[PDB]
Ligand binder design. Sequence first.
Ligand SMILES: CC(=O)N[C@@H]1[C@@H](O[C@@H]2O[C@H](CO)[C@H](O)[C@H](O)[C@H]2O)[C@@H](O)[C@@H](CO)O[C@H]1O
Ligand SMILES: [Ca+2]
Length: 226
Amino acid sequence: SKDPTTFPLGCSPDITTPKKGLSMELYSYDFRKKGSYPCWDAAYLDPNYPRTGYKSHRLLAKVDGVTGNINFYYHATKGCTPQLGHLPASYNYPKPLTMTNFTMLLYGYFRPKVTGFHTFTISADDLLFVNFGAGNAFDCCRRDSSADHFGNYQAYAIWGSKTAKDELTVHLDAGVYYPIRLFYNNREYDGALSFTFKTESNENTVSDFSEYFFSLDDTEEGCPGL
Ligand SMILES: CC(=O)N[C@@H]1[C@@H](O[C@@H]2O[C@H](CO)[C@H](O)[C@H](O)[C@H]2O)[C@@H](O)[C@@H](CO)O[C@H]1O
Ligand SMILES: [Ca+2]
């Protein structure tokens, strides 16, 4: 149920109009004390960090309606220094934040337009961990109760690996709502996130998620498929 799979389970909500976009939570991420070498904290790679550790830091912002092109590259100018900047407009959060050092959680549902094999390509500085599918990300219209219980990642990218890029090929059904969780961190300096996909049905890369990302209310019974 929770394991990654090429045939992720999806959801069938009883809702005539879903809400556009994913939800986002932003969290602080500190450097180690001055005189530390390296200056940055390796906590971001603690195995618990994407599940619980990120919540030991300050919740900075919680917003809805994240969609469009969510890709970014923040070029820092100084090492081992908090520097302010902005997320792209697509994130619905125009306040400044420490773009050199922060954590971001996105969640909601991906609804495909076509049926078939989708190949998602991701890259990140410093990390992007992706869950995708009911159970693997969270349970259908039962997100609040299953949010902390995601399974092993469907895809991940870590700066400093051999390549810092990953693919995920999954077969999806058009119009089905698939639970998705993105977890991002910048430890220091530059920060970057790339999230795009292709399908077998044409050669174009999709980078604008405007009619693909949705939010659904939880219900007592949930909204499983099949
Ligand atoms: C490996 C390392 O410590 N590099 C320093 C730079 O910081 C890293 O930058 C990479 C991207 O190149 C990445 O964002 C990583 O998260 C950062 O830790 C930077 O501080 C630079 C300043 O001149 O020095 C490098 O040594
Ligand atoms: Ca970085």
